[PDB]
Amino acid sequence: PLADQILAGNAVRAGVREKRRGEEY
Amino acid sequence: VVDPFSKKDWYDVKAPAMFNIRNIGKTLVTRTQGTKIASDGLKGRVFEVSLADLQNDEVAFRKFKLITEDVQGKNCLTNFHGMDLTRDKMCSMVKKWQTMIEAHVDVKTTDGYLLRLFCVGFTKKRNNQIRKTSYAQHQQVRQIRKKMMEIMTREVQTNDLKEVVNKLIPDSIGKDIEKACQSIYPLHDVFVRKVKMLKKPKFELGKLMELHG
Amino acid sequence: PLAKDLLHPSPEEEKRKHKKKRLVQSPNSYFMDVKCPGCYKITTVFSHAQTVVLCVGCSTVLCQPTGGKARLTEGCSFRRKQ
Amino acid sequence: LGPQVAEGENVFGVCHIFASFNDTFVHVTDLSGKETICRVTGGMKVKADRDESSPYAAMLAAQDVAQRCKELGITALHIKLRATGGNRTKTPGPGAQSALRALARSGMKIGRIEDVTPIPSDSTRRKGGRRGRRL
Amino acid sequence: EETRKIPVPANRYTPLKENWMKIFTPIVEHLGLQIRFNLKSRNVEIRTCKETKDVSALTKAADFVKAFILGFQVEDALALIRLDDLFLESFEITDVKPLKGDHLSRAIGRIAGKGGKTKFTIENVTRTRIVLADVKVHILGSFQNIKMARTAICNLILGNPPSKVYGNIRAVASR
RNA sequence: CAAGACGGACCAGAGCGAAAGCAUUUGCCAAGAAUGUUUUCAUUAAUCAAGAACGAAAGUCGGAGGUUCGAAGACGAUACCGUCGUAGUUCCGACCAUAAACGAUGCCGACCGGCGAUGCGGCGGCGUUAUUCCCAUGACCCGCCGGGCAGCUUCCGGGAAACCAAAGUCUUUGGGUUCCGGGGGGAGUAUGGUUGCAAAGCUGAAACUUAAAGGAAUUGACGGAAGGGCACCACCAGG
Secondary structure, eight states: OHHHHHHHHSSOOOSOOOOOOOOOO | OOOSTTTOEEEEEEOOTTSSOOEEEEEEEOOOOSSSOHHHHTSSEEEEEEGGGTSSSSOSSEEEEEEEEEESSSOEEEEEEEEEEOHHHHHHHOOSSBOEEEEEEEEOOTTSOOEEEEEEEEBOOOTTOOOSOBOOOHHHHHHHHHHHHHHHHHHHHTSOHHHHHHHHTTTHHHHHHHHHTTTTSOBSOOEEEEEOOOOOOSOOHHHHHHHHO | OOOOOSSSOOHHHHHHSOTTTSSSOOOSOOEEEEEOTTSOOEEEEETTOOSOEEOSSSOOEEEEOOSSSOEEOBTBEEEEOO | OOOOOOSSSOOEEEEEEEEOSSOEEEEEEOSSSSSEEEEEOSTTTOSOGGGTTOHHHHHHHHHHHHHHHHHHTOOEEEEEEEOOOTTSOOSOOHHHHHHHHHHHHTSOEEEEEEEOOOOOSSOOOOSSOSSOOOO | OOEEEEEOOSTTHHHHHHTOHHHHHHHHSSSOOEEEEETTTTEEEEEOOTTOOSTHHHHHHHHHHHHHHHTOOHHHHHHHHHOSSOEEEEEEGGGTSOOOTHHHHHHHHHHHOGGGHHHHHHHHHHTOEEEEOSSEEEEEEOHHHHHHHHHHHHHHTTTOOHHHHHHHHHHHTOO
């Protein structure tokens, strides 16, 4: 749709990205 | 430096007695400052009023030009000046796989209002027809055009503008030609698409009293 | 398909074909007797007549020429010959 | 000031919106069209030829003419659209729709819409050459 | 009350019938507006009621069905319902250059492009929608986006190859 | 109110005309295709040089008119673009006779596929309509025949292929007849002749040089371009 393309063109992608970084006895 | 609209004043313009709705509205006119009279400034004013603003239940695609030439003390009196169809109707009514037949007459009425009539009809598809196109041959188009001229001339020439305008209110002329041309090639949407006013006689004020009441 | 006898065509097929294109050409026209209702005399007219045919005594119009066959007047009777 | 008309019934004017391909005119008149009330272009709202034909300039023009008519008392309008017509384009552009929307937003009642543009039966030769276009 | 009328042509009657559900549900649900299909006059009748507010929606709803009259999809006219400054602008192909017969057809073919591809590109680049009628061109979008797509289309019927316009229209939308 | 122009939409798988071309109504004028024909003549026919008729647009002479557009030209911006605008564009009367004037495809004839649309004429036929028409006739519907215009398709054969119902019926080569070509440049040049006021138009070489010039399709590659993804041996905020 045209509304979806305009709204998605003026917004920011967010969310998905994973970073793998980095007792009892 | 000073607002001229405070100097202006409001006058009332009203439709004649052939229509249901009579009060067609207001007109802003300058007051007389001795140089120019207001009556001369409002003696030639043409109004483009739709039919549904003149009658309640009627159609809206029919427009009447009404000419105003009279004053009666905050009461403008108007008279017929022309008739035409809306551009929306004229554009939507010209389809494709079908012929347009159109004609015009110059004709004098019974009381001097010489006028020109333009009408348009369209060839019609039958209900059991499977052919895409409904085209009339040239001689059928000429016969249909001659019949249009004869019919419109016969119910414009023998009557007065009261009866002419009350014919134009439901457009009995178009349905008359539609019924009359069913034996040459059947017709679809027959309307008197334009009414002109080529000539107006000498002004008489009693006839406006008859046309208004 | 690819096999039909040309010497013996079916009569509806021969009737359908163009008059020149038949096995042996033959016309589509005929001569007929017409009787005017205003008299008793018989007149021989061509079916595709191009001339207006008048009665010998009554002098009424018997046929009007048209594009193809002639239009006999409403009221006359006719009978095809042979 | 204003027409001596009761609260139930309004007063009709007509408003010619002329959306040329460089700016947009808003010319409001009475039902006859003889006497005028207001007319606001793209130039009297923005002082930039960039935004002369802009929908924003037409929006400001329509708000200005709507508040002016409600000041004077014309509380309903018939609307007559117009393009530049003739040999040129015949269709009202975004400026006309912007002006119509903006003066509909003002709360003033809108009457009958009619597209009145000078479409010729047949006219003269086109402004461009046999080659010449917009860009 | 207030009422608008929209004429539907004969070629648009079957898509109007087959898509009618998603025409009237976006008008009666979140605009609170009344609509009917007058078959005798072949019109769309849109009228207000006691359940409507934000009166401009009426006018906006009008443009909605008008776009579906002119050949746009239901989703793009739905965008006309949602967004506030969206416009539809229209011009004829002969309005920029006199094109006769086969030249007019070739001009249409260059605007459409092979498989439709070229016209899709302009839409996908300019966030507009483009309906090619028999001769008319209708562009639905914002004013700057309409200006961009109209310049690209006029360049396609300037005589320029579709390839140069493809590359250049991908380049110009970076401003 | 006026002046000239143009006849939009309807307007097409259309129609007409030898082609160029032709779209407001009405009247007049003389032609014509196709169809119908148990008319007439009786081989009168096909192709053709010179010449003749018309021949888009532009252009050259005499007038009339100049609405729009607009070569040249004058400005303003940056060859493109905008403002003004000459000749021209329009009409009459003489010229010039060229186009990608295309189907890039002499003319006449015979044989050879499918489907279902269209234009005109003719033929046969139930029905519905002309406010149930009171008979014919128009308008639709069904079928057929004849030439037309034009789609999609085809193990008809043909072709280098694109494609072609002719560009097929061709090494299994002969239906009749005209024009024209013989590798690429030199060169449409020089010269000779002809025509045209003129511009130019028709015809038109060789010496020498050269191994290519060219046609039809389809994708290998192809510096690159547009989207993503991961990374403190990349960045942001820092130490």
